[PDB]
Amino acid sequence: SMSVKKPKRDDSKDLALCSMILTEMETHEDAWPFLLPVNLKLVPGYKKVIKKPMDFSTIREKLSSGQYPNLETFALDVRLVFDNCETFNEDDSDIGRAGHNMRKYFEKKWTDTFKV
Numbered sequence: 222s223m224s225v226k227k228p229k230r231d232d233s234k235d236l237a238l239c240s241m242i243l244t245e246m247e248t249h250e251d252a253w254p255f256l257l258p259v260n261l262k263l264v265p266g267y268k269k270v271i272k273k274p275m276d277f278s279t280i281r282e283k284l285s286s287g288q289y290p291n292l293e294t295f296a297l298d299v300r301l302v303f304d305n306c307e308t309f310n311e312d313d314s315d316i317g318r319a320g321h322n323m324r325k326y327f328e329k330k331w332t333d334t335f336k337v
């Protein structure tokens with residue numbers, strides 16, 4: 222509270238580290254369904270069904286332009302990506318498997334980088 226501050230993380234590296242994790246996401250071979258915005262004019266259903274579309278390139282743009290206040294907001298966009306994927310895609314499909322694979326790959330790096 223007021224004048225009762227928790228000692229907390231050095232956040233000076235966070236921006237760099239997020240960018241590197243993202244770079245590793247972007248370079249993963251199963252990254253392809255997520256690199257670019259889903260085309261709302263070519264995929265029927267997506268716009269109506271998916272209320273907050275998200276993708277790596279949009280995450281990269283927000284990161285590089287200071288639109289993430291902190292770590293948790295960055296991770297929220299990343300998870301949003303794979304939550305949208307689960308919503309629209311059968312688990313038993315190429316894109317569906319990509320999402321599960323990419324999510325697991327992210328959470329691993331998220332924990333190894335920040336969570337001690």
Ligand SMILES: Cc1ncccc1N[C@@H](C)c1ccc2c(c1)OCCO2
Nearest residue numbers: 254255257258259264306309310316
């Ligand atoms: C993540 C996701 N969920 C639902 C629909 C699409 C997508 N990804 C787009 C880029 C996409 C991924 C794969 C494609 C494609 C578009 O257009 C046709 C060929 O295969």
